[PDB]
Design an enzyme around this catalytic site. Structure first.
Site, PDB file in Angstrom:
ATOM      1  N   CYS A 230      -6.278   2.399   5.675  1.00 38.63           N
ATOM      2  CA  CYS A 230      -7.379   3.023   6.610  1.00 38.63           C
ATOM      3  C   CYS A 230      -8.373   2.090   7.147  1.00 38.63           C
ATOM      4  O   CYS A 230      -7.898   1.219   7.948  1.00 38.63           O
ATOM      5  CB  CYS A 230      -7.507   4.440   6.133  1.00 38.63           C
ATOM      6  SG  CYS A 230      -8.323   5.395   7.347  1.00 38.63           S
TER       7      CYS A 230
ATOM      8  N   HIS B  81      -2.922   7.601   4.396  1.00 38.06           N
ATOM      9  CA  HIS B  81      -3.073   7.766   3.144  1.00 38.06           C
ATOM     10  C   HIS B  81      -1.894   8.007   2.205  1.00 38.06           C
ATOM     11  O   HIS B  81      -1.787   9.448   2.081  1.00 38.06           O
ATOM     12  CB  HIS B  81      -4.110   8.644   2.987  1.00 38.06           C
ATOM     13  CG  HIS B  81      -5.529   8.174   3.398  1.00 38.06           C
ATOM     14  ND1 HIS B  81      -6.264   7.717   2.687  1.00 38.06           N
ATOM     15  CD2 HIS B  81      -6.014   8.384   4.642  1.00 38.06           C
ATOM     16  CE1 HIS B  81      -7.588   7.375   3.249  1.00 38.06           C
ATOM     17  NE2 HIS B  81      -7.217   7.779   4.512  1.00 38.06           N
TER      18      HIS B  81
ATOM     19  N   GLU C 294      -1.601   8.411  -0.849  1.00 38.39           N
ATOM     20  CA  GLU C 294      -1.734   9.122  -2.123  1.00 38.39           C
ATOM     21  C   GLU C 294      -2.612  10.265  -1.666  1.00 38.39           C
ATOM     22  O   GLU C 294      -2.445  11.209  -2.569  1.00 38.39           O
ATOM     23  CB  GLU C 294      -3.360   8.378  -2.431  1.00 38.39           C
ATOM     24  CG  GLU C 294      -4.578   8.556  -1.783  1.00 38.39           C
ATOM     25  CD  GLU C 294      -4.722   7.463  -0.480  1.00 38.39           C
ATOM     26  OE1 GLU C 294      -3.708   6.699  -0.100  1.00 38.39           O
ATOM     27  OE2 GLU C 294      -5.964   7.314  -0.040  1.00 38.39           O
TER      28      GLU C 294
HETATM   29 ZN   LIG Z   1      -8.365   7.375   6.480  1.00 36.90          ZN
END
Ligand SMILES: [Zn+2]
Ligand SMILES: [Mg+2]
Ligand SMILES: [Mg+2]
Ligand SMILES: [Mg+2]
Ligand SMILES: [Zn+2]
Lengths: 622, 616
Positions: A512, A597, A599
């Site tokens: 990110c 992401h 995760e």
């Molecule tokens: Zn992000």
């Protein structure tokens, strides 16, 4: 409250709890509690009443239950079901606050098993029409009431159950003259009746002719509905007829006759009634008053004797105590007779086996509509029926199958990892990873997924100094802010970390914020998305494979290129949306990066994706 | 006097009533202190007593975030620690029955940031914070304020009582009084529980506002299909998964989602469970505060909050924590998020904090409405809404009811105590099984006659009377096969032949018609209980009928052998007979004595005057 406690724990075998209509403005409601000996006198003339006595306080002497078959004393005929004349001497009498008393009554399951009317709606409609055509229409009289009975079975009956019904009635029903539970040994009675039969205080007799019923919609009473009711000619005639008929009775019991007041609207929980009152003076003996007023025209019809004959022609069953009287017979402070008596309607009789019978009828007149009269009987039994089987016992909206399905669907096509049991849940086996946190604890979630792949992990902050030789791979983490804002110390520090890892050839994976910063380092433009991808699942092509991934970003890298060559770096392969040029991920000579992401709970197969990303990053290591 | 009794009588300067999860309420009392940090909570070293035992109730304010190094508008709210010196439980129903009601109306009730200003902030958060990368969701507090007259903790007990009887789907319903400050609320959301190493959190977001008319299945389904509400819940789930991944070494496991139904709204929620061995004080510090009431990422959220809130938060978004020991000595924690909660100062100033989870697709007006729905149950507990009927006292009902008494009989509405030519005339009234006779007797007595009622079947000496009234009754007047009807025929024939004055009512009027030769017919629509305007021998009258059968004739006069000429009052259209006037008698189809007759006593008096005409 020792008497109440004894009624509660079975120590008073014969008892009554009666919540009356005597209290004033801002007074707590009180319940009268009675206990004493039961007898079965062979007539009204033989009620066990002592000669006059005065104590200086109002005092009750007897609670009497008068069954329908008691009409034999007037010479009228009746289906004889053996229901006895019952008298309870009030040996003990206490009052208890309603709220405290109700709090002490334990709840009990009182669901009615095999619940049904003995005369079903279609059969009852036919009876109604016969009474209108063949009785009213041949001169038997002007109005009659025909009883049907709602029946059911209580599992495992004991008076605890009746107390539980009484409790609910007290909490839900309004506009009643008495709410009560009376247990005589032979039988239990629980009800919420709107209508006094006859009261007597200091020679003043009162009756209360009630007829005309507005059935509330399920959604509640309305002003338009009540106005249309009060303008209904049938309902208004009905009330006038029962008024005339109680005036007859008052004219026989009171030497100067009755005086009318009202009419009034009595509001209950599920319906309202129109009513009048009649008052007069009398000095007749209570026994004679009771005999001569058996039973009110509102629950038999008129003329009274002809009604008993209509009732017998159309009811197959006896009435038990339906339409009968519950009478509290007493003394005032100085020795004069007192009577408070209620009509037994909106009442359950429960026999010793737990069988429940709830009698109900309606005043039938020349312009009655049979279907409306059927609906009127359902309206009248609704509050007592609800006390047995409360509509809030039913399944909640949350348990509706559409809601359960919609909720279950939320779990389809999202991360499996986080739903698996705690623990629970490779070239990567030996591998040590440093995760650099840039002020978003998504790091802790990346660490758990990396650990499931077999990596050992350690988390530091952006501003810390570390020894990179202890790690095989560095994860550069997500965080808030604008990746182009290099005059924020934390962001600047991310730039320095990425430039150093690139220059050293140290394997790394950028997530990110750090992915965005990496793009800027490699010369790829950054831009604000017009609509932020902040907390959304998006299906993407990730280097030739379709994936469903979770995004939390406002900014994105953007390019026309699938591959570029970058000075000091080499070839960088770019996975991008072909329509917009938005960059999803990078694969470089010694690193990988992702805009999304892996995760997140919004990524499908996150651990596998992270494993692929880390595998790529360490590709030059031997 | 138990603990609860002392709380109720004002004898506990610091107390808590907490209804958690035959519902029971926990009652706590003890010593209050304001420790300077979570690390200094006065917690003893472990003890296993063999039973579960609570040690401390702790109120954690928003500004406690300084312990994490985050910045907040510091309003000096203290970290409050109440030692649980005494702890009793009381049945909820009994407790509520003992709490006296009290007026708790909120004066000058208003939000500090009004709807328009709040919608502007919401847009700024979406455009300038979410839209510039601060994070994905944030919660901005506004406060509903008001003033309680004559405040004392009795008033808070009264609010708690109403909340307990009206609110559902809460995690805790509570009143906690510290001396300086009272907290009363019904929060849906646990903050963190710890029981035998098992930690649980409950991320809640997404709200269905009930219409005033009530929740519906169509409304719930449309809520659960709303992409914004679904995304919102996912985000807070992720954000609590972060937190659980930091406090639990193996992280959290998600279960749910579930629909939590309250009194005025419902929420969607997930649960997360994991194992932890951290000290309770570290668990509390590291979980300040839930992302459901701050935002994400957490540090960025504290900055966003500070940029857009001018006021400090007090205990809004903070934690109420009960810290204890189980039977075997292990740590227990039950804690709730302070939302849907009133803080009340000594002066009786009430502050109710509320916000909502703002996301990229939030609609500012909807978020405003969401804040109204969330404060609704608590606000209703202070100021209960109006009834839902009072129909009987509605002016249109009262008018309609009063109108029932117009144009009906005056006589029966007069006091019974106070109500010539006929004066001292003696009437015998013969009853044919309808006690309208008792009503006729009262009206005749008012005219000054002496009256006596007998039955049809009785033997009487007619010399003691001046007039006989032959009464109404059930049955078909043409049915001479009924002994009672046959007996009425014999009475009328005897009175006719003797020339005895008489007046016949209804059934007896019909029989008289038959005896005189006037046909009887059955009406297809019976006149049973109806007021009808008739011409009675040239005078319009309004009279009450109770009859199914009627005499019918084309004639205004009939000549009858044994009798003479009888004058007939009849409807000229249909020939229906209303009344007769003969040489020594009168009769009426209708009931002069009924409540449905206007001027009944006068009409009766005319009929009796006519009947006795030949006597003198
Ligand atoms: Zn992000
Ligand atoms: Mg038939
Ligand atoms: Mg009716
Ligand atoms: Mg929301
Ligand atoms: Zn009649």
């Amino acid at each position: 409250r020792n008497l109440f406690d004894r009624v509660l724990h079975g120590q008073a075998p014969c008892f009554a709890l009666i919540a009356r209509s005597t209290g004033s403005a801002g007074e707590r409601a009180m319940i009268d509690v009675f206990a004493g000996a039961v007898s079965y006198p062979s007539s009204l003339a033989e009620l066990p009443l002592a000669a006059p006595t005065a104590t200086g306080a109002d005092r009750q002497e007897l609670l009497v239950m008068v069954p329908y078959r008691q009409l034999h004393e007037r010479g009228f005929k009746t289906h004889d079901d053996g229901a006895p004349l019952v008298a309870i001497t009030c040996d003990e009498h206490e009052t208890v606050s309603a709220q405290l008393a109700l709090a002490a009554i334990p709840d009990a399951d009182t669901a009615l098993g095999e619940r049904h009317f003995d005369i079903d709606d279609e059969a009852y409609a036919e009876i109604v029409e016969r009474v209108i055509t063949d009785e009213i229409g041949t001169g038997a009289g002007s109005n009659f009431v025909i009883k049907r009975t709602l029946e059911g079975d209580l599992d495992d009956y004991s008076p605890a159950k009746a107390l539980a019904v009484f409790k609910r009635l007290m909490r839900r029903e309004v506009g009643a003259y008495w709410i009560f539970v009376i247990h005589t040994g032979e039988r239990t009675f629980v009800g919420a009746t709107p209508e006094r039969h006859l009261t007597l205080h200091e020679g003043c007799a009162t009756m209360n002719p009630i007829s005309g019923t507005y059935r509330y919609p399920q959604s509640g009473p309305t002003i338009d509905g009540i106005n249309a009711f009060l303008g209904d000619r049938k309902e208004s005639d009905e009330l006038y007829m029962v008024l005339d008929e109680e005036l007859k009775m008052m004219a026989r019991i009171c030497p100067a006759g009755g005086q009318v007041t009202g009419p009034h609207l009595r509001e209950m929980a599920r319906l309202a009634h129109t009513e009048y009152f009649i008052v007069g003076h009398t000095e007749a003996d209570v026994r004679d008053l009771l005999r001569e007023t058996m039973f009110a025209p509102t629950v038999t019809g008129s003329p009274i004797e002809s009604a008993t004959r209509v009732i017998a022609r159309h009811e197959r069953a006896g009435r038990g105590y339906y339409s009968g009287i519950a009478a509290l017979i007493g003394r005032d402070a100085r020795g004069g007779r007192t009577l408070d008596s209620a009509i037994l309607i909106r009442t359950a009789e429960i026999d010793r086996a737990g069988h429940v019978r709830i009698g109900v009828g309606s005043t039938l007149v020349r312009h009655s509509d049979a279907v409306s009269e059927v609906m009127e009987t359902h309206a009248k039994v609704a509050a007592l029926s609800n006390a047995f089987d409360p509509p809030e016992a039913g399944p909640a909206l949350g348990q509706h199958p559409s809601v359960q399905a919609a909720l279950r669907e939320r779990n389809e096509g999202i991360a499996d990892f986080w739903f698996r049991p705690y623990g629970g849940r490779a070239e990567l086996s030996g591998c040590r990873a440093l995760i650099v946190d840039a002020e978003d604890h998504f790091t802790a979630m990346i660490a758990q997924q990396l650990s499931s792949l077999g990596l050992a992990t350690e988390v530091c902050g952006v501003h810390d100094a570390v020894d990179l030789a202890r790690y095989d791979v560095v994860v550069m983490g997500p965080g808030p802010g604008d990746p182009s804002d290099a005059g924020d110390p934390r962001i600047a520090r991310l730039y320095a970390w990425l430039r150093h890892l690139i220059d050293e050839g140290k394997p790394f994976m950028a997530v990110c914020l750090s992915h965005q910063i990496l793009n800027a380092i490699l010369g790829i433009p950054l831009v604000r998305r017009e609509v932020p991808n902040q907390g959304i699942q998006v299906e993407i092509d990730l280097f030739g494979q379709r994936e469903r991934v979770g995004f939390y970003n406002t900014y994105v890298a953007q390019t026309v290129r699938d591959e570029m060559d970058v000075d000091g770096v080499g070839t960088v392969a770019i996975s991008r949306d072909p329509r917009t040029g938005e960059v999803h991920a990078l694969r470089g000579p010694t690193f990988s990066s992702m805009q999304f992401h892996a995760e997140s709970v919004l990524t499908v197969d996150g651990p596998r994706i992270l494993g692929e990303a880390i595998t790529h990053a360490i590709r030059r290591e031997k």
